[model samples]
Target: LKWPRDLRPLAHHDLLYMGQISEDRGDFNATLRNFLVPRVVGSQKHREVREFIVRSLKDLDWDVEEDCFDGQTPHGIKPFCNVIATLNPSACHRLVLACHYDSLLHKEGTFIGATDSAVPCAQLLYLARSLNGKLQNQKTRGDGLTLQLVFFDGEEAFERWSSHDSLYGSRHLAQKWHEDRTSAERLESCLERSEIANQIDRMEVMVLLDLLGAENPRFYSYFGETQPVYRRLVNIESRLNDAGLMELPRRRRRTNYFSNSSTVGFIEDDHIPFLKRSVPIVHIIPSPFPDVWHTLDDNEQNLHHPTISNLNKIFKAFVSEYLQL
Candidate 1:
């Protein structure tokens, strides 16, 4: 398949292949459990989580870069790192799948943030592992676009959520990438050399995941431009469900995770910085969020196995279709 100017829906055979390579329950649970701890930014647990994510992608032989910087938080300046992994670093364009890995800093007790973002992080890792072989094959075929995963740090606000206090990692990275221009000499040698002024310019689209992992999560079309891509996800879900490839929870068996209706206002999250830079974005976050969002109860106990697994299948299918793997 050619680089997608318009994304194609996954064909029947492609869907079946995705089902075969999808992660099993044990492997899925273990990956989520790795990030199921209270990993506040700059803490020891947070550092370990960063290492775990870095190592996981590195094992798959992706080019990984840790974008570390100091940012001004409500409390003071704090250290933050955004993990970037790319299947083929030299590809002209990128299909970015991103999530924030840092848990919120709570005042009372530990917040594991299972649905808050830990599940989203695990989802990216799961996608990388599941599609590594196909992605490699696509690379060998000389696909101009490649997959890039970004795990943002310091997504949480120290005291309150505001413009200056929140999104420390994403804000910093977006600006950095915006200014980082490619050398004219580098572009002179490349055939696909136009419109790519900087790193942010290379992003075809950024699919940001947040507040996932709970059962019956509903995702709305937030931006008009991304509605078509969002509809592609809706199509994938419907087809997978119809084929019985998706093991949805019984009570929510008829649940449609992606909605066709578009939303006017958007939730404030890690995507804002990139969105401001005219980057195409598909924000795959559930509206109203999960009930346990930003709470101690947002732990593994509240996570639904069937729901997570269903989402895993849908996302794998989405990536497969997008990359034409």
Candidate 2:
């Protein structure tokens, strides 16, 4: 339950809970592929993720809102669903923490987006549990910080593989938030719409994770996301180096992969819309991507836990610094 029903503490207040939180045991590699590999996204798999997230937050007494929306890809024959769980729905700072949950539905066989997506989505389970007790207290969470766990659909290509073909989920969400600017309520609405309520214009930041399970996960900042958010990365990197956190080799790519100083690069994914709105985002995706990209071999077997853990630690460091608890 990510929605605040009482409107007392949760709906009215932020998603603050005790330090006590819940998480999954063992590695995320398990049950990761069963969703997209064996089957495409239907209410069954979608509900599985929603139920898992609801149970995880409910166990810690956090009000959960299931923000369900209908969406269509550029080529999708039918619309797909997107789900989001709100933590601290009361806070004005709505930080969208997102990753696509659907796998590629190729004509012949399905492509299990393990690192392409499942790895990051899988990591969110452990992350939500870890941040349970760490983020709820007003000393931490109430300080203008609200986390929205978004499981996006229609990110995969329905027919042709292109930037326009992908990113259907994020585009829809972005537009919904913009509708508020023209709504009949006209800035006097008591409560804002789900995805449109302050969708990152005033947001502190938008951090995205994708294809992060590689052995040497080189997180190259897609030029668009990096140009504005690199300072945050430097701050995070300095923290790890200061803490003597020597695990993965950390180095920034000299060249911009997507954009140049003269021309802005683009990933054409969820962050594109947010970045267009001048919202800072951490595009933490694999540098070269992976061999199994859009291929049949991308599966749980290719999943590397150390990669997930290291990235998770870095992300935790970022949160720990921001909250300063």
Candidate 3:
């Protein structure tokens, strides 16, 4: 089968074990702290952030690729790099978990961009670490689908948001993947799937996360094609909450993070390039922007630990089921 027909949901015991592994919260905290800096593209901090992601993924034995290139920013040409990590690069199908790591360049002050994407980046790193062992087991089981993580740089425009200015990394990588037929040849030699032509085609879905880590984040389904997967995320959140697995503080009113309603329009981010190329996308971003949207106040102090922890659990459960780990 091109895609796994039966997605085995993680049992309660498995979810409990996964929570125990991440109970210390050391990995998530450290990664979020490391990314909580003014790491704009072309800056030294940015390079370090990219290196951190590469090193983290590599240490977990993922096939890491730093897609480097020069981008035409409004300021001029600037070097941008996108980090791509795959568990089983040879696999014919992939489930991509992605986010942009670059902070927006402000004319006056430093922008930490914690909720903007630092938090999301840190979440992905934590997910990779938490799922490393299970993914390895999945590999041994010989599952055709694999997991991929993309950390896109230069997602923020140097001056202002524009089609030509934003999404430098994703635009470049999407085009590159579209043209590269090498993967097709590799698959042809091994598998009988002739329709799988390029790297982008191998991606079953790209789950893009942004502006998270806030107290209350409401995510809505944005695309028809990926609504089912989005619904799965909603269901996971409900299950986790029902099991009392979510770390949110006790309150009379419970907040549903994943909204059942579909959004009328899509918000532009790192997923746009791939979306245009027909890559299925599940954008997990809030409707109303965080209060500290592009301000320096969007730092560690503003982050909600319970929300982050809850999100981590939800993603862990969702990915585990999707990969049938």
Candidate 4:
């Protein structure tokens, strides 16, 4: 049932783990845009996604908080949202992990962001389920790292281009977190997290996952020579390889995100909001869109499970190595 299909746009509907949707692997590349990440939140579709995350985490024994972000972007009239939750909050050392859950609204028949994102969100869930009670107060008390998984909305700019159009939700969060850290009633109603007394530091590394499930995927280092993040990313990658979990197709070549560079260019995604603030950013994306990129055929069959599984493995190693856990 569509359940108030018009009013709540975000309905509580979700594709089951059966059928084409792969379980645990996060290799299900194609599920209609409307089906996976609700194109427009504040719709019946948005509530459905919120509900699924809530149910999934609660079942995993997480202490949950519903988060709703309200902000007006330069593009549109209404305010957008991004949901977030944290694990092992009391840990002294913290790691902010994030991925946008909003799919682009273009491509009426397409716009289903499978490899571009859905897999990353699935990766976050698996991390949450696995790390629920693992980070104890003993080993990491003085140096414990917290994982903050953010399900950002409006990351896709409403316009044809991204520089001026995308990253609506993250922009709002940056502005809000930068200026005012408050706990208001509206945020509480949204089942979202409230801002505590914490700072977004340059030391806080941002590792963003985008376009990961390509058939012959490789994580090329994208940052340019101007920044030192490339070295940091390589350092992280080396540890991941040592974990015997995941291996990049190439660690020698750097991923490119320069202007007017055809071989590679900026995705201008949610992470851009953070990068602009001078925080070290690592973007894991495939150069050029995949075969199913932004097309109607961007379905589950295009996904490669080993790519996703290995990504999860790499993520675990990255964290374990990053915080020296």
Candidate 5:
């Protein structure tokens, strides 16, 4: 059992009750108002969304930084940035949560990109708020591990998606962060660089969320190594169902919401760069793809409220247990 010792110190029923009771819907509304716009990379709308993410994280008193870089796209030279927020910047390892904030450039009209990940980013904000107080109470969560939130930019390819064209921001930042890893400890003098090869492997778990906020999405476990961590999420979902939050019949409840696909397949996403660096990852994305994926129909008009609540509850409990909050 590699799980935390204090994991589930409280009963499952009580944890579900308080996790739901402390949930805030305002973050969901804020997600719609601020990010439900045309957030194409290198556009004004994208910058506004980035500003809001940075400001919102700062308001929570977390140390935040914008990783800015120039991305050479097929269209032209595109400048991109990624928002990085952490509760404890000094920790050697962290629980990383990520989502791409850029929406595809659609010519017909505004593309809100709700499930493609505006809602996922909003859910991270809600989790940050819910866990902030718990993080502050050193007696509760302690300072063992840090929590990091990342909002990636320039995920969508400008013209056609090629290995080199798409995922511009993630590729750049992953390399830069690894190069500048000497800041983990404050020293009076420069520490010896043993060509230590710094990389995202320092992360305990990197949970990448995308195409979420839809109703009962068929989420699949893409990587086998992270099955135990993924099962933690499934366990949380079952607890919610047992507490009657999911409204599912007791006979229909199951612990394996994630597909155990026999054939291994890797998804091309923001996690690619880190995964390439041998970082462990848990991708919380829908399988069979959502009906409105990459289409104009991926708007708030098609979202399911109950699904959002259930997803929120699962994420809240999973994160709480991970951080021993």
Candidate 6:
């Protein structure tokens, strides 16, 4: 019953009506504010961004916590902090939506990592605001699914990335939760494992978003394990297209992947740590990366507004459907 949950069908008109809830709002303006500063890990600027995120969520009265740890990065041993904001604290199963908040460090001008992850960061906030009531009142919605937002630090390598230098925050938290034996209800529903092993299996699925906010950004499922879930998203996109909900003037393939290719390499990002522990994953990063990736040009001036709007619509629909909110 747990491993293969049913994908409920929502009427097209209902989806179109739900789409209206988040349409044309001023959330992206706040998105711009978060990226106004460069947030490299362990820096004062990073702490500023962290405070902004925490304060924004706390202002909304959501439950929030900090995962502070020190890890070895390319820069040397440094502290990394991961932020966790939850819609329902008592609910056991989590549908984790994650994005890394750090940008690549450049010695010269500003590198905001706008599309790299900053926009995705903003998208999470937008969703939190839009889905505010749906995630609360667990007694009414009592299925046990909760919204868990994670902001990871040190995703970008200091010099050149190696296995040792990247994903400092995610790697640390996954192991920390594992060692802490923090249990969730999904483990009991699905595995029937002893209470202790259930603790390490808190995530039902972790959807990691990155390198978004370009004009009609193209995404793919790079791993075979998550292909079914990826296709479910594709189905949602197609149905949204049918409902006349897709606003992009020129939309290409919404979702795809290298079918059978040795040429394509595996993606290295925040999802890697969770995937290694057998967590089901839906990585929403664009393929070929963004054009301004790791460059000075990736700032506020270069982002495409249509791309953010398009992503906002689809993700709102997908997550609402996923959590049955």
Task: Give each model a TM-score.
Answer: 0.92, 0.72, 0.92, 0.67, 0.86, 0.86
Residues forming the 10-long window of minimal summed lDDT in candidate 6: 255-264
- What lDDT tens digits, residue by residue, belong to model 4 across residues 230-272? 3434444444444333433565532222222212345545565
lDDT of 3 by residue, 15-61 (tens): 77655444448867987888999888888989999989999999999
Provide the overall lDDT of each model, using Cα atoms, as 2-decimal numbers.
0.82, 0.55, 0.82, 0.52, 0.73, 0.72
Clashes of 4: 23
- Per-residue lDDT over 141-255 for candidate 1, one digit per residue giving the tens place of the 0 to 100 score: 6556789999999877786557677888889899999999984244322234447678887788889998898888888888777766778898888888777676744534655
Q: Estimate, for each residue in 135-240, the C-alpha lDDT of model 6 and write its tens digit.
A: 5653246565678899988777776656677878888888877776655433323423423354346676788888887765667676666666666677776776
Segments of candidate 5 deviating more than 4 angstroms: 1-14, 18-23, 138-142, 183-199, 247-270
lDDT of 4: 0.52
**What's the number of clashes in each of the models?**
0, 10, 0, 23, 0, 2
Better of 5 and 6 by lDDT: 5
Name the regions of candidate 6 deviating beyond 4 angstroms: 1-3, 21-24, 137-140, 182-198, 250-270
Residues 1-325 of candidate 5: C-alpha lDDT, one tens digit per residue:
3532234443565466544643366656765568777788888888998998998889888999998988778878888999989887665567899989999887677888988888888888877876678766632233547788988888877666677888887888777766665443442111233122453544667899989866668776777767777777767776676666664335666434555455257654646678777677888888877889988999988887667777877887777777666
Stretches > 4 Å off in candidate 4? 1-39, 58-67, 71-76, 90-93, 136-140, 162-164, 181-198, 224-270
Per-residue error for 86 in candidate 4, Å, reads 1.7
What is the alpha-carbon lDDT for the whole of candidate 3? Answer: 0.82
